[PDB]
Symmetry: D2
Subunit: 446 residues, 4 copies
C-alpha cells in the first residue's frame, strides 16, 4: 500500500531512513513537496507594503501575519495600515472555501556604545553595560491600549528581560486585552539567561536576531536561536525567527545562497514562523520576498527528520489525562502511519489545533473554526491551516460537526491540500463547547 | 510499581539495573496459558480450578486416545467452561485446540550395544525380527534421506546411531549412545529431508473430528513446507474455514523454511521437544528466539512449548531453570506458553497453571517496553488500512494517558489482533458476539475476550454503545477499570467486520 | 557467515532476534567460565582430568559438608589433575580453586525427632523449601536445611567454623572465596579480615541468597570482587517467580560495575540422573549467558550426579552458541556510555582495542598482564574477540577465569635479555597457543595489548597484527 | 561546561539544542578549514601574512579570469607570505594552493557596450548558425554551443547572464530554437548561458582548462577545483590532463548543475572530494532547493570519508560592510553543523574591503559551530555506517578515536607520508585535534581538506635508527602542540604510528601523557 510514485515525493525516502546520516544522504532535489506550507510568514508593514493592492498580492503570496512596527509612526499611521490590511483581507471573504485569515501583530517600541545596527563602536546599543530603563514605557502603554482598541491579535513585546516584563505588558493590555497573544522578543544577554522564566509566562518567543546580534557576539546568535527554538518546541509554544533572513532582497530580486540556507535551516531547527522586516517594509521586492520564504519553507518542511523529531517530542512531553492531548498524539501517530494528507480538527479557541501542531505531524492540520480571532491566532502554530466557518448551526449538532468537516474537505480540495483517495484524520469532540475533544476517525476523501 | 522505573530507562543496561523484586505487578496477565488435557485434567472439578487459575486454551493431544476419549475431554472442558456462563460479566472464554498426531516413524527388550553394529532394514519380512543387530522402521524412505555419517535417534533421542555404509540390506549403523529399545518407539532423522506425507490418514480423520466437534485451533505437527499447511487446511475443508492453524516447527527443515511457513499460517508453535532432537539441543534457544522475533514482526501469534515446568510433574515447586525459562519466553515476546505433562499427567496440574500465570505477570512488567514499542513501530510498514491506522493511534493514545484498557469491538478478532501486535501496556478488552472468535483471540498476547450475548438493538449505534458499556462493566467487575480511569475505545463506522476506524478517549464512571 | 555475524550487524534488537541462525557456527573459544562443584562424582584424579578437558575452569569446594582433611584430598586431587597437563605449556589450562563457605545455616507440627515433631539446631521452610510450616507440605527426610524468610535473625556475619574454614583456604592457597549469605558490607569485611594479610590476594565473591542481600546489593558489590546469584536459597527466600528479576538486575549492575557475576544452581538439574537436559535447562544456561553472566555453575550435576562430565560438556556447548547470540552492538555502546571517562592508560587502551577488534572481527585480543587487571579491563567492555591473557603469575592465570572472555596462558620462561624481545616472545607464545587450541588461524587479525615498560600498571599500547 | 559539553552529552537531539549555551566558550582548535579566494584585496605579501594569521588554510586561484603571469604572481606572493614563517618550524602553518578551473562555458554573441532588451513575453530565436555569430538583437540570440538545439526540448528553459534572462523553448525548427521570453532583462555581449536540467554535451575539459592545468602542474599547485563536473568521465579527463607528473594533485569536483547532483555517486567514487558550488547550483536548479543538494552531498561525503567544500556568498555582505548579516553568520554555522570539511570565501577576500575580517569571522563562527555539534549521535552513526575492514590503518584509526573520546585526549598525533592515516582519523569526527606530522610539504598542505587535521612540516633529515626517527617526529608533534596551545603538561594524547617505514603500514596506537 501507498503507491510507488507517491513514496518518492515529499522526501519520503529520506523520511524512512534509520539514521540522521542516511536521512541527509537520501534528500532528493527531484522530490517535490506538497502545496501546504506549514511555517507561517510574518511581513512587516511599511511604505513598500501599505497599499491595499500591494497587500492583496502579499496575501496571495503567503503572508499570514502583518507586523506593525511601532518603533516608527503615529497611531494615525498604524490605524490606516490596519484599515488597509483588513480591507485587502476581507476582499477575499466573498469566497469562503479559499478565504485566508491574516493576523495583525503589534511590535512594541520598547526601551530604545554601538550605533547604526552596531556598525561603529566607541539606534544605540549598550552591550553588557546594564542600564536602567523600565520594562514598559509610558508610550508603550499608550501603544498597547491602541492595540486593544483596534483589536490586534498578537503583541511582539520588545526587550523582554524577565517574567515581570511580560506581566507588565499583560497588565497594560487590560481585561479587554486578555485574549491577545504575547510573543516575548528575546533581544539581549539577560533575556537569554532568564529565558525559562520568560517563556513560562509568555505565549511564545521571537528570536530577535537584530538586537541580539549587537548585544552578544555575532558568532553566538545561532546558538541562542537553536536553543530557544528547541526549548519552545519542547514547551509546545510558538517560536519566531526574525531579522535579515532575506536582507539582500531589499534591493535585489533574488536572495543570496546564505539567505535561502538561513530560511531553510530556521525551518529545520523547528521554527513555527519566519519573519521579513525591511524586505517588506522598505524594499523593492516585498511580494517576491514573501514568495521566496514560502518556496523555501515548503522544501525545508519536507526535509525535517520527522521520525526522530516525533519520538523525542513524544518522550519529552509529560503524560497527560487531558483527552485533547491524548487524542492529538494518537491522531498525529495515525497520520504518520498512513501519510495522511491532512488532520482535520474542529476548534473554537484553537487549543485542539495547537496540541496537534506541537507534536509536529507531517500532515497538514486543517483547523475549522467559527472564531475569526482563533483563525487569525493559530497562524503562530506550525502546520495549522485555519478555515473560517460562517454558517449558523445545524439543528442536530452531529450534523453541524459533519458539515464543518466537509467544509474542511472542500476547502482542502480547492487549495490542493486534498485529493480523492487521500486518507485524512478527523479530530472532534463528543459534545459542543471548548474542551471536549476526544475523538479521532480515519476517513477516505470522497 | 509494575517496573515503571525500569521501563523508563534510557538504556537496556540501566533498565536491567532498575528491575525491582519489590515492585508488584498490577496489570493483568497478557501471555495466554495452554494446558494439555490428560488423566490429571479430565475432571470437571479440576478443569474449573484450572480455569480460575488461568487456563485460556485446552490442548487435545491426538498422539494418543480414541475419538470417543477426546469427545469426552471436549465435553468436560465445555461443561467446566460453561459453568460460568450464568454471570456474563465474568465469563471467561476458553479455546480448544487439536494437536495432531503427525507423521510418526516407528521401529519394529533388546539392548543396543554401545559401539556395536546394528542395521536398520526396510524389507517387510524384518518387521518382526527386531533385536540387538536388527532394527526395522515403517518409513521406507529412511534409506534415501540419511546419508553416510548422518544419525538416527530412537526413543526421545537417548539412543543414537550413525550411518557407516549404505547397501541393499539397509543402512549400516553404529551405536553412538547406548540404551535398550522397546516395541515400536519414536525415531528421529536429524537434519534429513523427511518427505513423509504432510498429512497422515489418521491426521485427516482427526481433523474431520475436530471440525465436527467445533475445535477453535489446530496445532499442526511437523510442518516442513507451505504445502504441508495447505494440506492441513484442505483436510479441515471449508466447513473448518474459520479454524486457526498454528504450525509446529519441529525439525531442521521447518526452521529453514520458516518464512514460507509463517506466510501461510495463522501462527507458530516452537515445539522444542521434537526440535531438541532434530537439531542440537544447544541450538534450540536460537530457533526459539528467531521464530518469536519474526512472529512479533509479522504480528502473528507464537507459542513456546515443552518442558517449561517439567519437574512439576512430580514436585510441587519448579526448578530455577524452569522458572527462568518461562520468564525468558515472555521476555522473548511469546504470545502463549504451554504445559504438557505438567497438566496432562502430573500430580500438580493446577499448581503448574498457577506458576505460569505468576511468572508471566512478573516477566511482562520486566519487558523493556520503551525499545520494544519503538522497534515494532518502525518495523511495521506504512498502511492505508483504517483498522491498522486506528490501532497504532489507539496504542499511542493509551501510552499518553496510561490507559487502564483499550476496549475494542470486533467480529473476527482482527481489530484486537492489530492492537495486540504493538504490545500496549494497557489491556485489550475485546467485545465480540462470535463465541469462536472470543476463544481464538486468546492466541494474541494482551487480548481479554468478552462474549456478548444480547440480541441486536433496533438502532445500530445503540447496539455499539451497549457493547462498549458491556466492556466497561465487565472491566470494572474483573478489576481492569476504576472510576476516574481513562480508557481508549476502538469502534467502526458501519456494521460488519473490516470497517474499524474510530478511536475515542473516555473517562470511566 | 558464522558466529551469528548477520545478527551481530542488525540495526535493532528485533532484527537481531530475527537473524539468529541455527546453522551459523560459533567460535571454539568459550567465554563464560564453568564452575563445577566437587563431590563424590567429581573427585578421582582421572575424572577431574576428564572435566578439565570438558571445560571446567573453576573447582568449587562446598564447605557445608566434609572435613578439612576431606577438602585437602579434593584440593590435592585437583592440583594433580591440573598439573598433569603442565608438561605441554601451549595447551595447559589453568584451573582456579574456590572455597564456598558454609555460612549461617539452620538445619534439623511441633518444632522444638520423627515425622510429627522436628528438632532444629537454632532457637518455616524445610528440605530446600519444599515443606511449609506456619506457627502446605510434603515428605521429609533426616538432616534438613531450614529457611525462615522474613523475621530478622540473630546469626552472625561470620561464624567460628567459617573463620576456621577461611584460614584453611589461605593455608592451602585457594584463589577464590564464595561467601555465603552476604547481607551487608560488614559481612565482606569480616571475610577479608579472617583471610588476613596472607590472604589479601584472594578474590571474595559475595553470594546473594536472601531478600536483604538484594536490597543492600550496591554496598555489598562495592566492597566485593564479584557476585554470585545463589538462586537455590534465594528461590526459597523470595517468591520463586521473582528470582529472574533479581538475577537480571544483579547481572546488569555487575556488568555496569565491571565486576564478575556468577549464575548458579539447578541450571542443568535433571542431568543429575539423565544424560540429556530439558528444554528449559538449556534455555536457562543460554539466557544466563545472554544476560551477561561471567560464569555459570554446576552443583549437584557435578558433585553427586551420574553425568558430571556430560554436564560440563553441555554448558560448554550452550555457552558458545549463546555468546555468539549476544547483541554486542547495543551492549558495547551502552557499556561505553555508562562507564565514566578515564585518564588510566590501561582502561583507555582497553576500550580502543575492543573497538578495534570489532572493526576487523579480530580472532583475539592478546594482552600481557601480571595482576590480571589489563585483561579484566578488556573483559569489562565485552568484546566478541577472545581475550588471550599471557601471564607469568600462576595465581592471576587462575583468578582471571572470573572475567568473561579471558583465556589465560601461563608463561614459564625466564626473561629474555632485551625486554622488547621478552614481550614479543610472550605475544608469540599466545599466538602459538591460540593456533594449537583452535583460537587462531593464518590470515586472522589479532589486537595485541602491551605496555611501554616492564611492571604492572603501564599498559598503553595497541597493535594490529596479522597471523602468519 | 566549556565545549558545549552538556549539549553533546544530552540523550536526545532536542535536549542537546536546549542545552546550547552562549556563555560556553570553545577551547578546541578550529577544525573546519577556510578557503580564501586570492584577488586584488588579497594579493599583497603583507595582506596575505595577515590572512594566514587570521586563519586562511587554502588559497584559491580563480582561473576564470587573469593571465598565467597574474596567477604566477599570486602564487609567488602566497608562497613568500607562507615561507616568511618557516624560520620557526614549531609554529609554521602549511597553506595549500588550489586551482579553480574556468571550466566549459556557453556564451552568447557579440552584438563595446552595445545592449539590447529581451522583452517579457516576446519571441526570441536561439541559433548557432555561424553566420549569425554577430547578428544579435531583441528577437535573436546566438550561442557558441551548437548542440544546444538537441539538449533542450520544448518546454525546457534557457537561462542567460547568471539566470537574469529566462527563455522557454516553444518549438524546435531548422533555424534553431524558437523561444518565448519568460523573464525579461537587458542583454549584453558574451553573457553566460545555463541550461537547467539539460544533459550538456560539452567535454569534461575546455581547451583553456588543459593549458591552465599544465600551468598548475608546472607551478606545483596542490589542489584542483574541477568546474562543471557532471559524470565520472569528466573527472577522468581532468586527471588525464594533469598527467603522471600531476598524479599527486588532489581533484575536488565542483558540482554545479542538475546532472552532477543526480550522478553524484559515480562522481564521488572517482574524486578526492566535492565542492558544493552553490553559486552555479542556484542558477541551474531552483534556489529554494540548493540546501537540499548541500546537505545530501555533505552527508554522502561524510559517509565516504572524503572532504567536502561548501562555497559561495557565505559572508557576502562583508564585501562592503565590516559585519555580516544574521543570515550569513547562520549559514556558516549550519554548513559546519552539516559536516562540511571546508568553508569558502570568494569576493569577500578577492575584492571586498574587509578580507582579513571575513577570514576572522568564518574562523570564529566555525569554532562555535564545531562545539555545537551533537557529537554523540554523529560518531555513533559514522561508526556503524563505516563497514568492517581488515586494513590495519582503518582498524587503528577507529581504535585511536575511541581512545581519544575515553580520555578526552587533547590530540591524536599521527605520523603520515601521504596523509591517508590522518584522513582515516578525520572521517570519524573526533573532537581531539588530529596533529599530522609529515615530511612531504604537499601532503601537509593537502590534508587541510580533511576536517580536524592540523599539519606540521618536519624538516630534519632521517636519524640513523628508524625508531629514533619516529620518536623524534612524535616529540616534534608534541612540542609543536605545546607551543600552539593544543597540549598542556599532564594532558593525554593518542599517538598513531606504524611498524615499518613507508606509507601503508600504520598499525600502532599509544596512550601518552604530555611532558
Ligand atoms: C529532527 C532532527 N534534527 C537533527 C537530528 S534529529 C540530528 C541528529 N544528529 N545530528 C548530528 C549529526 C548526525 C549525523 C550526521 O550525518 C550529521 C549530524 C544532527 O545534526 C541532527 N539534526 C540536525
Ligand atoms: O479546541 P477547542 O477550543 O477546545 O474546541 C474543541 C471543540 O470543538 C468541537 O469539536 C465542536 O464544538 P462546537 O460545535 O461548539 O464548535 C467540540 O466537540 C470540542 O470540544
Ligand atoms: O475486528 P473486525 O473483525 O474487523 O470487526 C470490527 C467491526 O466491529 C464493529 O465495531 C461492529 O460490528 P457489528 O455491529 O457488525 O458486530 C464494526 O464497526 C467494525 O467493522
Ligand atoms: O595488567 P597488569 O598487571 O597491570 O600488567 C600489564 C603490564 O604488562 C606488561 O605488558 C609487561 O610487563 P612485564 O614484562 O613486567 O611482565 C607491561 O608493559 C604492563 O604494564
Ligand atoms: O598515512 P600513510 O601515508 O599511509 O603513512 C603512514 C606511515 O608512516 C610511517 O610512520 C612511515 O614513517 P616514515 O616517514 O619514516 O616512512 C609508517 O609507520 C606508516 O606506514
Ligand atoms: K502431538
Ligand atoms: K567562477
Ligand atoms: Mn529589536
Ligand atoms: Mn512431535
Ligand atoms: Mn546457599
Ligand atoms: Mn560556473
Amino acid at each position: 500500500e501507498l503507491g510507488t510514485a507517491f513514496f518518492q515525493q515529499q522526501q519520503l525516502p529520506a523520511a524512512m531512513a534509520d539514521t540522521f546520516l542516511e536521512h541527509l544522504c537520501l534528500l532528493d532535489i527531484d522530490s517535490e513537496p506538497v502545496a501546504a506550507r506549514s511555517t507561517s510568514i510574518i511581513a512587516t508593514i511599511g511604505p513598500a507594503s501599505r497599499s491595499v493592492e500591494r497587500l492583496k498580492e502579499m496575501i496571495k503570496a503567503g503572508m499570514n501575519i502583518a507586523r506593525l512596527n511601532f518603533s516608527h509612526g503615529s497611531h494615525e499611521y498604524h490605524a490606516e495600515s490596519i484599515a488597509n490590511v483588513r480591507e485587502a483581507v476581507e476582499s477575499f471573504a466573498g469566497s469562503p472555501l479559499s478565504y485566508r485569515p491574516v493576523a495583525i501583530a503589534l511590535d512594541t517600541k520598547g526601551p530604545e556604545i554601538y550605533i547604526d545596527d552596531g556598525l561603529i563602536s566607541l539606534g544605540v546599543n549598550l552591550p553588557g553595560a546594564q542600564v536602567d530603563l523600565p520594562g514598559l514605557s509610558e508610550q508603550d502603554v499608550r501603544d498597547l491600549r491602541f492595540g486593544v482598541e483596534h483589536g490586534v491579535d498578537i503583541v511582539f513585546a520588545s526587550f523582554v528581560r524577565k517574567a515581570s516584563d511580560v506581566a507588565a505588558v499583560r497588565a497594560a493590555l487590560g481585561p479587554e486585552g486578555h485574549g491577545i497573544k504575547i510573543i516575548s522578543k528575546i533581544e539581549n544577554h539577560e533575556g537569554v539567561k532568564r529565558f525559562d522564566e520568560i517563556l513560562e509566562v509568555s505565549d511564545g518567543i521571537m528570536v530577535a536576531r537584530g538586537d541580539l546580534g549587537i548585544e552578544i557576539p555575532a558568532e553566538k546568535v545561532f546558538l541562542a536561536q537553536k536553543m530557544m527554538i528547541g526549548r519552545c518546541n519542547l514547551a509546545g509554544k510558538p517560536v519566531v525567527c526574525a531579522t535579515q533572513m532575506l536582507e539582500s532582497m531589499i534591493t535585489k530580486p533574488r536572495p543570496t545562497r546564505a539567505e535561502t540556507s538561513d530560511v531553510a535551516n530556521a525551518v529545520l531547527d523547528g521554527a513555527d514562523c519566519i519573519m521579513l522586516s525591511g524586505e517588506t517594509a522598505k524594499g523593492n521586492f516585498p511580494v517576491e520576498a514573501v514568495k521566496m520564504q514560502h518556496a523555501i519553507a515548503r522544501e525545508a518542511e519536507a526535509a525535517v527528520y520527522h521520525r526522530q523529531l516525533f519520538e523525542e517530542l513524544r518522550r519529552a512531553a509529560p503524560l497527560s489525562r487531558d483527552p485533547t492531548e491524548v487524542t492529538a498524539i494518537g491522531a498525529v501517530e495515525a497520520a504518520f502511519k498512513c501519510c495522511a494528507a491532512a488532520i482535520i480538527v474542529l476548534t473554537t479557541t484553537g487549543r485542539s489545533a495547537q496540541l496537534l501542531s506541537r507534536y509536529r505531524p507531517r500532515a497538514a492540520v486543517i483547523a475549522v473554526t467559527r472564531s475569526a480571532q482563533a483563525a487569525r491566532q493559530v497562524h503562530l502554530c506550525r502546520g495549522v491551516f485555519p478555515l473560517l466557518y460562517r454558517e449558523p448551526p445545524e439543528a442536530i449538532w452531529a450534523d453541524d460537526v459533519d458539515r464543518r468537516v466537509q467544509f474542511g474537505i472542500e476547502s482542502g480540495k480547492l487549495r490542493g491540500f486534498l485529493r480523492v483517495g487521500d486518507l485524512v484524520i478527523v479530530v472532534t469532540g463528543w459534545r459542543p463547547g471548548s474542551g471536549y475533544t476526544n475523538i479521532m476517525r480515519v476517513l477516505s476523501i470522497s
